[PDB]
């Protein structure tokens, strides 16, 4: 699976972990767009993890327990990408109606 997957990734470029995360990147600072507080270490790790997925053309799941700032992390993802990759738009977020204004 991994072999064919990594080859699928190579098509998308046109152990398991290091293979899946062949392209790496990390960042000590949060995206400068972000205001209203700072990110927690693990959130930063999560960001880096998501960034790695981006770099390796992989999709993934933020399965961190609950109430751990994923909303913020996804926002930081947006701003990260905009400050680093600079592909501003089009970016879609889909949420429950009961959570709309929490997100806004
Ligand atoms: N780095 C952070 N700085 C400040 N508050 C945070 C941070 N991470 C999480 N929070 C708290 O959690 C909320 C944001 O995420 P929340 O909705 O609580 O969890 P999730 O986004 O995982 O559902 C905010 O109310 C905030 O107070
Ligand atoms: F992941 Be949060 F608790 F919506």
UniProtKB/Swiss-Prot annotation:
Residues the record lists as binding ATP: 64-71
Lineage, highest ranks first: Eukaryota, Fungi, Dikarya, Ascomycota, Saccharomycotina
Name of protein: Nuclear protein STH1/NPS1
Role, per record: Catalytic component of the chromatin structure-remodeling complex (RSC), which is involved in transcription regulation and nucleosome positioning. RSC is responsible for the transfer of a histone octamer from a nucleosome core particle to naked DNA. The reaction requires ATP and involves an activated RSC-nucleosome intermediate. Remodeling reaction also involves DNA translocation, DNA twist and conformational change.
Subunit (UniProt): Interacts directly with SFH1, CSE4, histones H3, H4 and H2B, and via its N-terminus, with RSC8. Interacts with LDB7, NPL6 and RTT102. Component of the two forms of the RSC complex composed of at least either RSC1 or RSC2, and ARP7, ARP9, LDB7, NPL6, RSC3, RSC30, RSC4, RSC58, RSC6, RSC8, RSC9, SFH1, STH1, HTL1 and probably RTT102. The complexes interact with histone and histone variant components of centromeric chromatin.
Similarity comment: Belongs to the SNF2/RAD54 helicase family.
Superkingdom: Eukaryota
Annotated localization: Nucleus
Note: Present with 1990 molecules/cell in log phase SD medium.
Residues of the full protein shown: 411 to 535 of 1359
């Amino acid at each position: 699976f991994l072999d064919s997957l990594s080859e699928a990734v190579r098509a998308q470029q046109n152990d398991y972990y290091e293979v899946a995360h062949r392209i790496k990147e990390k960042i000590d600072k949060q995206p400068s767009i972000l205001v209203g507080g700072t990110l927690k270490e693990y959130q930063l790790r999560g960001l880096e993890w998501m960034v790695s997925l981006y770099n390796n053309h992989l999709n993934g799941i933020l399965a961190d327990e609950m109430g751990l700032g994923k909303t913020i992390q996804s926002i930081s993802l947006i701003t990260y990408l905009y400050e680093v990759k600079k592909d501003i738009g089009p970016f879609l977020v889909i949420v429950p109606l009961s959570t709309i204004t929490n997100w806004t």
